[PDB]
Amino acid sequence: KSRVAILKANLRKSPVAKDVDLEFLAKMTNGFSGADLTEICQRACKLAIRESIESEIRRERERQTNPSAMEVEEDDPVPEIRRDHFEEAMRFARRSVSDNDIRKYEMFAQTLQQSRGFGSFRFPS
Amino acid sequence: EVGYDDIGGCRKQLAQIKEMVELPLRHPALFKAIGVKPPRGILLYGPPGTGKTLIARAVANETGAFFFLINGPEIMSKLAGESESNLRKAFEEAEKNAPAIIFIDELDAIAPKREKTHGEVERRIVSQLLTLMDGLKQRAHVIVMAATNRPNSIDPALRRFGRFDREVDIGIPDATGRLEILQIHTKNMKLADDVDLEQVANETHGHVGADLAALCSEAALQAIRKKMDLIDLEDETIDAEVMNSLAVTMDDFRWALSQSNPSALRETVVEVPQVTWEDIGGLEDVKRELQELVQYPVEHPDKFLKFGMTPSKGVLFYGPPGCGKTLLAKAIANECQANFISIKGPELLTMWFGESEANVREIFDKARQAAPCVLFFDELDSIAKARGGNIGDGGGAADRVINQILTEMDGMSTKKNVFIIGATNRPDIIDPAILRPGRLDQLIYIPLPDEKSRVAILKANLRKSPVAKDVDLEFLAKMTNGFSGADLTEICQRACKLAIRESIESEIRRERERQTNPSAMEVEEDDPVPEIRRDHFEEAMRFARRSVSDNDIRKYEMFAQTLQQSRGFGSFRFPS
Amino acid sequence: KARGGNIGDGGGAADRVINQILTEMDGMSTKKNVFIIGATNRPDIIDPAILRPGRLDQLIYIPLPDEKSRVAILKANLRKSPVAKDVDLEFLAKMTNGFSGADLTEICQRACKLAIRESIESEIRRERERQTNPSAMEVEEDDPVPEIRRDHFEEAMRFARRSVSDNDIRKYEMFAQTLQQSRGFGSFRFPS
Ligand SMILES: Cc1cc(OCc2nnc(SC3CCCC3)n2-c2cccnc2)ccc1-c1ccc(S(C)(=O)=O)cc1
Ligand SMILES: Cc1cc(OCc2nnc(SC3CCCC3)n2-c2cccnc2)ccc1-c1ccc(S(C)(=O)=O)cc1
Ligand SMILES: Nc1ncnc2c1ncn2[C@@H]1O[C@H](COP(=O)(O)OP(=O)(O)O)[C@@H](O)[C@H]1O
């Protein structure tokens, strides 16, 4: 749930198509940190931007050769981050936090734990 | 009388003996007009109780040769100075009934001298037996077959040319042969319909033909004790119909198997593995490479000979633990239908601690005899780990056991059939000499199973267990991002354990109800949990764990790219 | 431990005896009846091969006895000895915050020893008393200490000690959480 919330927060500004199931992406990210999810979202946005710039440019380059040649239709080749962009991003998905240093954090949390044997403590009735 | 039907086990050395002995015996007149030397002596060796004497008797009966049995201790028990007369008379009598077969059971008693050769009279017996055996004037067709537990137990001069020039290792029967032995030993007891002899055969690993007969007899005796004793109606001869009314049930066989104590479980097993490529879900590049290296030289030896290329006879699997290297080796052996010998790490460690590396010579000889074979050295890095790995001993990577293995491999390749497969979870510490040409040079990396591979592994682990169709396996495999084969097996085992505990607890409570509140009409609702459900798998996965950390996978990736094909030839083009 | 534990020998954890045990276990399971149980106070130094599947894989952690467990241990140790009903055992078990089973056994043994010494000394003096001053009528009052009393247990507990320090319990807790079932699957649900 925290991963889903982080993904939603990162992608709020970016225009994301409703077809992309963000919950599936969050659940597939087994142990990604918030930084890793932000990196994946940034990579997806970068992929979308590169595709949009290349497609619009290559269309304009061909169109500019003949003056007024093709129709004046106002096409948006990529108007939202698509699913393929999210697969493109996940291909480079990385686990920043190794399980050994998570082991160390849980170790320090255990050492900070309130010892043992006082759970059943009860005042005499 | 006894024949090939009586000889069970289908161990495929009886066929070799047949091919050996028909023409010398089945067509004796043929050798009279053709100048050829037949097999003067055949040494059948193997664990006791494997039917060597039975095999010899069956061959003698099926070929018509006069069978003569010279019991080892029968002559040895005779008085000194007249036992030699017994041996000489036995050979003369066998000579008279040409063609004849002389079987020397327990040959390791008449000529046990391994150059130690204690005593005086036994030296006379061994020398006179040598004179007789070498004294066969190639006239008539007497074939001398002898039985011995191991080839090295008998006097070496008996192993020399013309005395016993060819040896056959009958060996322990396998599951298929154990089943056939059970069938032959269970043919007049009117076996019950419930008992199939297949489950017993699979659970009968470690038994020999004598062990199988003893287990069958024990099951029959349990059946006789359970019934027909309560009635206590007995006479001089039990009625045939009354005794036939009983049927040996599966429970009796199960108890007998529990009370078996097989007479040589420790003996090494030479068996065609039953594992198949289906058990491993993937490794297509690895599967094809293994198929090439092993299968191609034999399936198409002519094409290998045409290009003048000698195929590599060694492959070293490296990868994280639990990924299926042993299973892959078994599968490759199964595809080629070649015998599989597995030398696990404990055996190597025992040879190293005991400073007894001559066992490597014995292991290689055994692999050579059972050709085609896939000699697999599982977890070959065990000795290096035992000596260290980070600092280790002051010396280098060389050790006694690996050196002996290298010597045997260098002296190998002559056989053209034995194929060495090595598996190691620590490629960094493995001795470099192991990877030199002529050794296990073809390094194959086994990576963690993929999603599809994980699905296949889960299916293979859960094939026997009753799994409800509701529980989706593809979802579980995909969910496990980096679980190893061992981890998936642990998850499946834990799910099965949870299901078993729940079923036991539930039926136990349900039985209390019947006992606490006796119902007027008995109507069992069957099993409350007949198959493994989604909740069992969810609880089991709750405890799922990744045994293999990503750092050790990183080290394996390093070594893999430590076998890097350069970085400047990728575009090599010939000048044209 | 004999080979070390902190630095040890230059070689790894493998040794002759453990290797033979592993070989026998690998060649075992055929019997279907023998069950191998292993106990170790130093799980960190145990050979990892011992824990591989087909070996002693099921690791079970035995923690220090709880208050109820401590009461049961005290009762078992004192079942044979004559213990006066006055001495409350639940209070003693609860008082022992972290005593091990061995520590409780030592406390019980010390209390019994104190009672035995007191009884011996007392009856010995009482015998002097008849020998020194022969009484006209013999009337033995029986045993001056027939059962273990509160004072004996208080004196014994005065010497009670905790054999097991909290640092070694911390190491065992570390290993226990070193067999940690991950941290991402706790909510695994099938798709439905
Ligand atoms: C023709 C040939 C066959 C061979 O052996 C084939 C073989 N048979 N059973 C087996 S074993 C069994 C199979 C499954 C499990 C193991 N093999 C075998 C050989 C190598 C690797 N794997 C198997 C060797 C070497 C040669 C040759 C190559 C070049 C030349 S020239 C002078 O340059 O023109 C002369 C000779
Ligand atoms: C049925 C079975 C019983 C067994 O053995 C039971 C047993 N008897 N005495 C003992 S020992 C004694 C008990 C107290 C002290 C020790 N045991 C035993 C076995 C294991 C662990 N603890 C005890 C093994 C294995 C199996 C089977 C499981 C699956 C399949 S299939 C092809 O997948 O359908 C085939 C066979
Ligand atoms: N494959 C088999 N088929 C039928 N009987 C067998 C088989 N294997 C072993 N036996 C039993 O083994 C018994 C004695 O073993 P034997 O043939 O003398 O071998 P060995 O001399 O090595 O001990 C025989 O009485 C026979 O019943």
UniProtKB/Swiss-Prot annotation, chain B:
Cellular compartments per GO CC: ATPase complex; azurophil granule lumen; ciliary basal body; cytoplasm; cytoplasmic stress granule; cytosol; Derlin-1 retrotranslocation complex; endoplasmic reticulum
N6-succinyllysine: residues bearing it: 469
Involvement in disorder: Inclusion body myopathy with early-onset Paget disease with or without frontotemporal dementia 1: An autosomal dominant disease characterized by disabling muscle weakness clinically resembling to limb girdle muscular dystrophy, osteolytic bone lesions consistent with Paget disease, and premature frontotemporal dementia. Clinical features show incomplete penetrance. Frontotemporal dementia and/or amyotrophic lateral sclerosis 6: A neurodegenerative disorder characterized by frontotemporal dementia and/or amyotrophic lateral sclerosis in affected individuals. There is high intrafamilial variation. Frontotemporal dementia (FTD) is characterized by frontal and temporal lobe atrophy associated with neuronal loss, gliosis, and dementia. Patients exhibit progressive changes in social, behavioral, and/or language function.
Family: Belongs to the AAA ATPase family.
Compartments (UniProt record): Cytoplasm, Cytosol; Endoplasmic reticulum; Nucleus; Cytoplasm, Stress granule
GO biological process, one term: endoplasmic reticulum stress-induced pre-emptive quality control
Binding site for ATP 2: 322-327
This protein's name: Transitional endoplasmic reticulum ATPase
Keyword Cell membrane: no
Region (Disordered), start-end ranges: 509-528
Residues with the Phosphoserine modification: 263, 503, 571, 576
Part of the intact protein present: 200 to 775 of 806
Residues recorded as bearing N6,N6,N6-trimethyllysine in the entry: 116
Record keywords: Acetylation, Amyotrophic lateral sclerosis, ATP-binding, Autophagy, Charcot-Marie-Tooth disease, Cytoplasm, Disease variant, DNA damage, DNA repair, Endoplasmic reticulum, Hydrolase, Isopeptide bond, Lipid-binding, Methylation, Neurodegeneration, Neuropathy, Nucleotide-binding, Nucleus, Phosphoprotein, Transport, Ubl conjugation, Ubl conjugation pathway
Catalysed reaction, written as an equation: ATP + H2O = ADP + phosphate + H(+)
Impact upon substituting residue 188 to H: In IBMPFD1; uncertain significance
Record-listed Phosphothreonine modification sites: 237
EC number of this enzyme: 3.6.4.6
Record annotation: effect of changing residue 33 to E: In IBMPFD1; increased ATPase activity; no defect in ubiquitin-dependent protein degradation by the proteasome; impaired autophagic function; defect in maturation of ubiquitin-containing autophagosomes; decreased interaction with CAV1 and UBXN6
